[PDB]
Amino acid sequence: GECNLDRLNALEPTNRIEAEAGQIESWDHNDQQFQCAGVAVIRRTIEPNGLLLPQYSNAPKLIYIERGRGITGVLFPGCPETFEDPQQQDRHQKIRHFREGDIIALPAGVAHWIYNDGDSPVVTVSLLHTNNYANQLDENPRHFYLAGNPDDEHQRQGEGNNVFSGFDAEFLADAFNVDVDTARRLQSNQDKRRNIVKVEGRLQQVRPERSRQEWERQERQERESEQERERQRRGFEETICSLRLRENIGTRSRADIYTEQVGRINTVNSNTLPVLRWLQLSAERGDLQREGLYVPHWNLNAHSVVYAIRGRARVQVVDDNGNTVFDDELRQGQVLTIPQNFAVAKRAESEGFEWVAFKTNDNAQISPLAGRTSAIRALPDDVLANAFQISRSEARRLKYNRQETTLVRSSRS
Amino acid sequence: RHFGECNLDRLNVVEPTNRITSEGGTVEKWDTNQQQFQCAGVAAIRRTIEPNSEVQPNYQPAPMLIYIEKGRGLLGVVIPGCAETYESQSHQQNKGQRASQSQREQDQHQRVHRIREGDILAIPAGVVHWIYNDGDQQLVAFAVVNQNNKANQLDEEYRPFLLAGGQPDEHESQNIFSGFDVELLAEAYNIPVDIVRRQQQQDKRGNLVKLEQQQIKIIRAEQETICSLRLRENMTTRSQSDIVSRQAGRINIVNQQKLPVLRYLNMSAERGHLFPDALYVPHWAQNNHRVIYVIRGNAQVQISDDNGNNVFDREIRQGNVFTIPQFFAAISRAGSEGFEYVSIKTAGNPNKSTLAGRTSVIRAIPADVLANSFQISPEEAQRLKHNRGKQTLVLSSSRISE
Amino acid sequence: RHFGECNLDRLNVVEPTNRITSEGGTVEKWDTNQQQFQCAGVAAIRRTIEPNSEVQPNYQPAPMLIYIEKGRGLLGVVIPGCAETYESQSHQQNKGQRASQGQSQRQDQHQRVHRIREGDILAIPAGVVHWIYNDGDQQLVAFAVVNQNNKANQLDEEYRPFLLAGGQPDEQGQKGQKQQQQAESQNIFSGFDVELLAEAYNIPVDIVRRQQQQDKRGNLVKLEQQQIKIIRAEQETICSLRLRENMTTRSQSDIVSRQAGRINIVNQQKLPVLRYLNMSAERGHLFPDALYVPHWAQNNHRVIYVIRGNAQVQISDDNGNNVFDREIRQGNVFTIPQFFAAISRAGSEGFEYVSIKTAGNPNKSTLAGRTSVIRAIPADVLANSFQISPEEAQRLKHNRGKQTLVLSSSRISE
Amino acid sequence: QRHFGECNLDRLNALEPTNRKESEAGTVEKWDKNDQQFQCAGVALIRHFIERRGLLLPSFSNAPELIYVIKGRGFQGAVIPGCPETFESNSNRQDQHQKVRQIREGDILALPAGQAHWIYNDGDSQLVNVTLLDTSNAANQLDENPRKFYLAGNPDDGTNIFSGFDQETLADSFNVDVDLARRLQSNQDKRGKIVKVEQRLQILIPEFEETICSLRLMENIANPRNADIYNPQGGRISTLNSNILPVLRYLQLSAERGTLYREAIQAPHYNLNSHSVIFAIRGNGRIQVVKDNGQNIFDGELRQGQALTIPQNFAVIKRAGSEGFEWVAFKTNDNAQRLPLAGRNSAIRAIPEDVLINSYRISRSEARRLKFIRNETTIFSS
Amino acid sequence: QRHFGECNLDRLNALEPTNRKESEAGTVEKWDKNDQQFQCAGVALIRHFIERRGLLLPSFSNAPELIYVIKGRGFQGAVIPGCPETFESNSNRQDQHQKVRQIREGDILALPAGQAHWIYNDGDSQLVNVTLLDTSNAANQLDENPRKFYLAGNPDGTNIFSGFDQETLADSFNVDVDLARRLQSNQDKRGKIVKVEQRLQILIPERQQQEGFEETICSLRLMENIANPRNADIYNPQGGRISTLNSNILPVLRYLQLSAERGTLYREAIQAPHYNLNSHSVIFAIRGNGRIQVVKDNGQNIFDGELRQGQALTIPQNFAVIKRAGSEGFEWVAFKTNDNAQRLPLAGRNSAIRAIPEDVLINSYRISRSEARRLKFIRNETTIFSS
Ligand SMILES: [Cl-]
Ligand SMILES: [Cl-]
């Protein structure tokens, strides 16, 4: 009975790992609310020139980039290395660039590294879906490092904590056909830098730096023009191995649902990012203005793990007995898990509210209770009338008075 | 509890839990309660079938893959609803019929497969199967059951249902017909009670029985769609291999892209041949647990977990069984006689990442990322990526020439 | 055309349209404008490769199934993007690289090769480069059917092989490469500028000149010496796809009639890549005087290749018209169009055949025997349909007993 | 896919409702979801009795359900999230709502997890529903409890989903006066889950996300024109799976409707890939169930209104009494598959005589009789 | 899959537009859809020039299309049948429509057959589109003509409403006959691309208003940027970069059965000789120039020339092709006629020559072993070759 939850709580990180060039914070995956939903949550902060060591996990990950910009190398076994220096010097797999607003999907068992090549910190919030079918190992989240000497993110031959440390140095030297001293160093037995390490100088790799700067400068200038106009208005390497793993759900200009002056919701799911079909996960990015109201709704086929990015919202959650199981302000940095089918509404405070919600299904569905497209509107007038002991005229008010779908201005509350 | 969640700091080679001596052979069971098997969600059975003996038909609610280690014989698997397309209708019944023939009015049965050394057999969950050793040597079958397969809606208890036979007594558990009322079964089959009485008899013979009566009226190929599903595949690396290193060995991956029904079992198998002192590159399986069965030779195997702990460091020999958990890293070095093994995995499309060699994830990482990650020079990083040259999964000794 | 729409009043066994004699063997082509082949939308090639000879690597935009009638050899098929996992890196190679303290980015490796043998069927995906090497005792004889109407072929109906090497045997102002290469079929490298290829491959122009030379040896060439340096097994994971399957009915059969014969049906439920080729094959062995039950194919055309013995075959169309009534002998080729009804009776020495089919999941309806559509009709429906007694209707349904696809003679005992 | 249970069973029992909740216009009966037979199958079973003019108020559940209409007739409205309203009044003459379906005896209604629906009894007498709540379904991400989230009324005698919200949030959300928003919470409604409509119900009707709005949710399994198996002296069976009703491939559920004639036998068999939950509609039948080790775990009768769970692969046989026997069975997988053990198409018929001869130590004449003497399939005549 | 066309290709020419239709606010150019290479590919190619404040009126086509944004920026509104309007004004103080998306240089937009859309130039540069209309697609059950069904305006009345009686229009829309006749656009002489009044008002975040399966429909992504260097699939600092767009990047493409490629060759660099396994490739030259050769089945060269900006060339399925940029580099988009189009390189890493044993090459070309090893291994780059 892991979802018999009489009260929900806004949850903050309970463990923090400090490393040489960043830190890692984890929420308590043993909290009944995370057990109910089958997930673990972690927040990684990478300083400029910081390198998150190559690693893989037993669970698929959806990473939201709250702040900063950088590069990530996802390691697809058997896929050709298509980024290479000119022949006469290095070759490696494709480099992906991430920025604030990006969602990154990492299948279980796929190794990756991440590097902050900007001037401000990278902050990434990750949902580990430990209850995922792809994880036949352990309900607890596990992290397998390929390099370095990490601390366990959910606690606080070789002596190090990466996988090479579990092998005899002689075995590794033989396998890699390298000197035994070099194989010993694979074990990172003397490394004091923990999970995120500092790069001296610039990280060298094959990537389109020059053209990328010309492209980002062009967009910044288009953002500038648009901002100004607005104030004036007053082989198989091409296919599987090229699989897209990121989508910018924060893009200012994109919306799946939008009420002018009120709010917007952007969603990523398998209809937009194909790999989510295999991860069985999705995400939404929500922004509410002052008085913006996300009307009462329920998630039909998913838990919704909400991470408050900034601002504040009064959130109400109701279970199957009509009990209010949450009625409080959700604050920046906190996580609220909304169990599948529970009804929820969110009303921003005067400063507004932004959130990202990770949903435990490939194409998570919601049903609004009020407004256009709502469950109430699908009901016959006379079903409403007899169900609530009201007239058919009052029933039509409940159905049509609110002409927006999903997001609307709330003046009373 | 902790073993179920693969919280093990120490894996061991798994020894058969019990031995049943039947009239026609011996059955050894690796039960689902061994800690390594709790982690992997599997059970195993080794059956040694004497010449001219058969196994008693049985079914179970989880799928399994069977490796024929030795001998030759005949396998029956029934597929409900499929027509019986193996038959021995004679000219004399043809002529008898036409000479005066309708509904009110010598054998027919479903297809039987010749099986031999090196075959892998796919038994879907719930399908009835039986085996006949018609050879002059012992037939040895090693089966791994995926107790955690989606197909098994019961639980992790290994639960075989017998159509015939029972637990042996001197060279409880009885067949399902014993639980039915005798007269009701007779009426259902429309047969004399005494035939049902013989079906329900306590059978002290066991799970495997001598074929006292001759068996040459079984229809055999060597005398449709779902019904046409192929169930056996020869795994010898010498006839088919995905990786071949001239001086190191061969690997043959039998997944759903070789044997279609493995898509639905969500199970696969690998056969490997390591020449003396060769290695299997360090690696981890991304979407499957593995049960390894050593068929020839010996090797040094090491396994590491997510905290850098060595969890396995053993010389394994012929007949040894051990588990490699999903996500754990493993490496193998064959002894000076080489090494041969079969690996049965809990995915129909298994995927692994290798760490050394031509297709490794290390070669996929920029050298300068490796340099900073391991605190080595870019030149040391370059050798990590490139010193193995062309070899990927099976690696020649870098130490002992030959 | 009347043929392209299968409005054929008579079908006949189809003889090879071209015979091309190369240094290393012979190529026989059944070309697409044969009337039977226009109906079925197929081409066929029979290749007989002399021992220690190789086919010149080639590819084509339609899928192909290849039956190995005799011999044994090695098959190569390239899958773009798959790592080359057959290699012969040597201990001396390894030692050298390590001890130098200098290995970095700045004796062979190639893709998987398959042992093929008599009785094998080979699946060649459209567009895949393939080559054959006969390293065995006897001539290697391969019979290939190419599905020109397959969805993978976006070109047109003319059979189109592209040669990486070899050519025809015999014992804004464009810049004139077409004028230059001429000096009636060449490999694709002859169509490219010499200097461009040299730069692209980073090799001296001399090697490119030899690549582009007109090669009068043909499609099959004798090898200098035995190719001992090829690595062989017996010396998304599409790279692991199986492309060969042995059809011998004695090793596997779906239908076995002790007194009549055997059928082995190789569809996508036995060889998974057939799902994507949307082709399949069947091997049958009929005992003397046995029959193949009257039937029709619901979702495929069939090309039949007679591999042993002989039989009489009849084919009927939707008019009750006999469109085929011939005695068929070893080596004959003929077509059964989709939906046409067909029956065969083996001769005195039996009959073996291979059938190549334009569906990965073939479906046929039989008319006589244990799984026939006739047994599925109510007896009184048969009685009124045929104007026969209910007694005769019953006999139609049950006189053939437990046999379904392969039927013993009802009139001659073994 | 499915969530696991504990299937160590020694004795099955024929199960009747253990809890009964009375509403103004009907009763809801609950079988004991805690029973080990239901925990093994991973399901709960519910029966609704809806009086004339009675309305089962709109609700949704975290468990997918199959609802079998045992008797009566009426209307169902399923609320598809995001789909337009395609039933409407003639605007030049008011009402507008999503499509409604007539339902009647024999209908199976399939409801995905989280989908709201209501039901109205349009007939003259009782409308009786029996619902299978598949709590171990992959689509139920909560736990074993099959919850009912009511959009209206006060099932607990607020207690609908609107009761838990502040009236001010409700007023703003619907854009209505505060007194009208309070009525949503149904605080003083004492009528329960099933209520009498005023007069007659006024309704518009003619007189995975991949299925946007157009998917069939109902199909009749009792109609004898639909029979899959028929023997004039044995009975008839009709199966419902994704090859008949596409939505069942997403719900991973099947159903079977059985009629045995007097003294007839349903062949001994086992369910290859699912549990089977039997609900006896009418008549009575002797049933026998046998577990993995050959032990009989049920040797008794099933009568009207009783339920019996057959775990996956357990062997079962049924023989009707002298008036016959009718049931519906819910099966916990898409395309549930039976393997008969006797008769045509059976496992015994597929095994060579020579193997049976050695298995049972019978002669060939006895193995021939065993294989071939019952020439019927699945349903055996008396 | 596709309907078939004639592919007896003896000669290819670089192709430029042959028809042009001028509107008041732009220009629509059509390549010759009856030139043999487009008939063989089964495609038509079109280019729109949309001047500032120009509006490409709403229309749908029987052909699925891929639209590449050559230059500029604007908005696209696709009309998904049956889906609710999820963009709306704040009613608690007007407009309501389906979601609109900002588009810009390098965007590929995918449009199923039969689906209406409109495009607006929101910038000051001309907005330039190159659209591939896939007329042999299984989705096109008409014929090889790529038809445009206009919902408004007078593209030649000549929109869809023009052919209905106004009484039928009046009753259907429930409007007066004055407004119904307006639907027919009988007096409109502006063509297909028209100037909006002042600036177009539409709902979009931070732009405040003033004064072929359906199983994915409603939530599909329809656009992806293939020119952004950060999305490169292949990159060589002295060769260039390639980016492929297929159903593993954009799920709707699995139902359109189309792919695309965006290439940039640096000065003098080479795109390895190769062929496309499973599709035709329609190359449109975006900038610079490239030497290109195409070879057909019997080894004969059928194209030996240059491709300059604004020109298009078709490489039929399996024909071999090589490209070498000029001294200023070469940039193109290629539209490919299958889901998950795949290239088989003939030279370099991952190529057919490299997959073949040296011994076979020795006998194939009559070269020595040292020649064979150099043939296989001397170019160690993949796909894009440096200069
Ligand atoms: Cl990406
Ligand atoms: Cl989009």
E runs forming strands in B305-328: 310-317, 321-324
d(CA B18, CA B28): 6
| Residue among A89, A177, A240 minimizing CB distance to C97 | A177
E107 CA distance to ligand 2 middle (Å): 10
Report resolution (Å) to 1 decimal: 1.9
Over its C-alpha atoms, chain C yields an Rg (Å, rounded) of: 25
CA–centroid distance, residue A43 to ligand 1 (Å): 21
- Chains within contact range of chain E (3+ C-beta pairs < 8 Å): A, C, D
Which residues in chain A have Cβ-Cβ distances shorter than 8 Å to C236? 236, 239-240
Distance from Cα E225 to the centre of ligand 2, integer Å: 10
Biggest alpha carbon–alpha carbon distance for chain D: 87
Provide, as residue numbers in chain B, all residues whose Cβ is less than 8 Å from the Cβ of D289.
179
Does A261 contact E208 at a Cβ distance shorter than 8 Å?
Answer: yes
- Measured CA to CA, the distance from residue E137 to residue E255 in angstroms comes to 10
Instruction: Report the distance separating Cα B302 and Cα B282, nearest Å.
Output: 9
DSSP D286: E
What is the dihedral sign for C-alpha A179, A181, A187, A193? negative
Torsion angle in degrees (nearest 10) through CA of E246, E247, E253, E259 = 20
Nearest to C353 by CA among C308, C288, C404: C308
DSSP D3: P
**Backbone φ, ψ for residue D203 (5° rounding):** -150, 145
> B16, B90 in Cβ contact below 8 A?
no
**What is the distance in angstroms between the Cα of C89 and the nearest Cα belonging to chain A?**
13
- How far is the C-alpha of B55 from the C-alpha of C70, rounded, in Å? 39
How far apart are the CA of E216 and the nearest CA of chain D, in angstroms? Answer: 6
Q: Are B306 and A58 inside 8 Å of each other by CB?
A: yes
Give the integer Cα–Cα distance in Å for B257 and B235. Answer: 14
- Asked if C74 and B232 count as a contact pair (C-beta separation under 8 A), the reply is no
Picking from E94, E9, E41, the residue whose alpha carbon sits closest to that of residue E279 is E41
Please list every residue in chain A whose beta carbon sits closer than 8 Å to the beta carbon of residue B288: 136
- Give the total residue count for chain E: 387
DSSP state letter for D273: S
Per the CB < 8 A criterion, the answer to whether D318 and D286 are in contact is yes
Query: Is-contact B32 B38, C-beta < 8 A?
Result: yes
Token pair belonging to A209? 């730096």
How many C-beta neighbours within 10 Å does residue E100 have? 21
Residue B20 exposure: Cα atoms within 13 Å on the Cβ side: 25
CB atoms within 10 A of CB B336: 12
Q: Does C98 touch chain B (CB under 8 A)?
A: yes
With CB atoms and an 8 Å threshold, state whether B195 touches D347: no
- Taking Cα atoms as reference points, which of B98, D213, B232 lies closest to residue E215? D213
Nearest Cα residue to A187 out of A151, A153, A145, A154: A145
3-class DSSP state of C118: coil
Q: Which residues pair with C308 in a beta bridge?
A: C352
| Alpha carbons C24 and C221: distance in angstroms, whole number | 4
For residues C40 and C241, give the distance between their C-alpha atoms in angstroms, rounded to a whole number. 28
Q: Return residues with CB closer than 5 A to ligand 2 (ion).
A: E 101, 221-223
The secondary structure of A90-105, three-state, reads: CEECCCEEEECCEEEE
Instruction: Choose among C197, C199, C210: nearest Cβ to E365.
Output: C210
Q: Are B57 and B164 in contact (CB under 8 A)?
A: yes
Helix H or strand E segment including D380: strand D379-380
Surface-to-core class of residue B358, CB atoms within 10 Å of its CB (0-12 exposed, 13-18 middle, 19+ buried): buried
Kindly determine whether residue A177 and residue C98, on different chains, have CB atoms separated by under 8 Å: yes
d(CA B269, CA B77): 20
Q: Is B278 strand, coil or helix?
A: coil
The set of chains that have 3 or more CB pairs under 8 A with D is: A, B, E
Nearest residue of chain E to residue C129 (CA atoms): E352
What's the number of CA atoms in the CB half-sphere (13 Å) around residue E305? 15
Nearest CB to D164: which of A3, A295, A323? A323
Cα(E219)–Cα(E84) distance, rounded to whole angstroms? Answer: 11
| End-to-end C-alpha distance for chain B, whole angstroms | 47
* Alpha helices by DSSP H, A258-341: 276-279
Tell me the two tokens of residue E231.
Answer: 């999305």
Answer whether B272's CB lies under 8 Å from B341's CB: yes
Q: Beta-carbon neighbour count of residue B143 at 10 Å?
A: 18
CA distance B152 to chain A (A): 15
Q: Would you give the DSSP letter of residue A165?
A: G
Please state, in angstroms and rounded to a whole number, the distance separating the CA atoms of residues E273 and E315: 12
Q: What are the respective helix, strand and coil percentages of chain B, to the nearest 5?
A: 15, 35, 50
At residue B192, φ and ψ (nearest 5 deg) are: -60, 150
Q: How many residues does chain A have?
A: 413
Query: Could you give the CA distance from residue A173 to residue C99 in angstroms, rounded to a whole number?
Result: 12
| Residue with the two structure tokens 């049948």 | E81
The tokens for C158 are: 């003319």
- Identify the CA nearest to E215 among candidates A290, D215, D96, C343: D215
Amino acid sitting at position E203: L
- Name the nearest CA neighbour of D132 among D214, D239, D226, D251: D251
Tell me the C-alpha distance between E143 and E138, whole Å: 11
Provide the shortest C-alpha distance from residue E196 to chain A (in Å): 16
Q: How far apart are CA C222 and CA C22, in angstroms?
A: 9
Report the greatest alpha carbon distance in chain A.
86
Instruction: Calculate the alpha carbon distances from A268 to A70, A122, A273, A370, D301 in Å.
Output: 21, 21, 7, 24, 54
The tokens for A47 are 């300083």
E103 Cα: distance to centroid of ligand 2 (angstroms): 9
Residue A376 distance to chain D (closest CA, Å) = 8
Q: What are phi and psi of B32, to 5 degrees?
A: -70, 0
- Count of helix runs (H) and strand runs (E) in chain A: 7, 25
Q: Which residues contact A81 (CB under 8 A, 6 or more apart)?
A: A91, A92, A93, B363, B364
What is the separation of C-alpha C65 from the centre of its chain, rounded to a whole number of angstroms? 3
Count H helices, E strands: chain C? 8, 26
Q: What span, in angstroms and rounded, lies between the C-alpha atoms of D310 and E189?
A: 75
Residues belonging to chain B: 402
Residues of E with Cβ-Cβ distance to D209 under 8 angstroms = 215, 219
Ligand of minimum distance to the alpha carbon of A97? 1
What does the alpha-carbon distance between residue A118 and residue A98 come to, in Å, rounded to a whole number? 11
Cα–Cα distance list, E44 to E41, E118, E145, E263 (Å): 9, 19, 9, 21
CA D290 to chain centre: 24
Tokens representing B245 are 């290193």
Cα separation of B381 and B368, whole Å? 7
CA distance C239 to chain E (A): 12
Inspect the interface and report whether the beta carbons of B327 and A203 lie closer than 8 Å: no
Cβ-proximal residues to C376 (8 Å cutoff; 6+ apart), any chain: none
Looking at all shown ligands, the one closest to residue E78's CA atom is 2
Q: Six-digit token pair at C271?
A: 């060889």
Query: Which candidate from E89, E247, E343 shows the least CB-CB separation from A235?
Result: E343
Q: Tell whether A29 is within 8 A of chain B (Cβ).
A: no
Pair of tokens at residue E240: 């260039």
E92 contacts in chain A (CB < 8 Å): 408-409, 411
Contacts of D118 in chain A (CB under 8 A): 379, 383, 387
Which residues does chain C have within 8 Å of residue E296's beta carbon, measured at their own beta carbons?
A: 191
Confirm if B9 and A166 have CB atoms less than 8 A apart. Answer: no
Cβ atoms of C133 and C230 closer than 8 Å: yes
Distance of CA B217 to the CA centre of its chain: 29
Of A85, A117, A156, A163, which to mutate for an interface test with B (greatest number of B Cβ within 10 Å)? A163
Residues from chain E contacting residue C74 (CB–CB below 8 Å): none
* Of D296, D317, D351, Cβ closest to residue B76: D351
Task: Tell me whether residues A258 and E86 touch, CB distance under 8 A.
Answer: yes
Round to whole Å and give the CA distance between C390 and B103.
12
- Name the residue among B128, B179, B191 with its Cβ closest to that of D290: B179
Contacts of C104 in chain B (CB under 8 A): 379, 382-383, 385-386
Using the mean position of ligand 1's atoms as its centre, give its distance from the Cα of residue A143 in Å. 22
| Residues D382 and D322: beta-carbon distance below 8 Å | no
CA distance D265 to chain B (A): 7
CA distance B195 to B202: 14
In the three-class reduction of DSSP (H, G, I as helix; E, B as strand; rest coil), residue D32 is classed as coil
In chain C, what residues touch E277 (CB-CB under 8 Å)? 80, 126-128
Among the partner residues C155, C166, C174, nearest to E317 by beta-carbon distance: C155
Type of residue numbered D124: D
Distance of CA A284 to the CA centre of its chain: 9
Asked if B140 and B48 count as a contact pair (C-beta separation under 8 A), the reply is yes
Taking only Cα atoms into account, the Rg of chain A, rounded to an integer number of angstroms, comes to 24
Interface test with B, best of A61, A146, A237 (most B CBs within 10 A): A146
| Residue C80 CA: distances (Å) to CA of A239, C77, C164, E342, E356 | 11, 10, 15, 8, 12
Answer whether B253 touches C (CB < 8 Å): yes
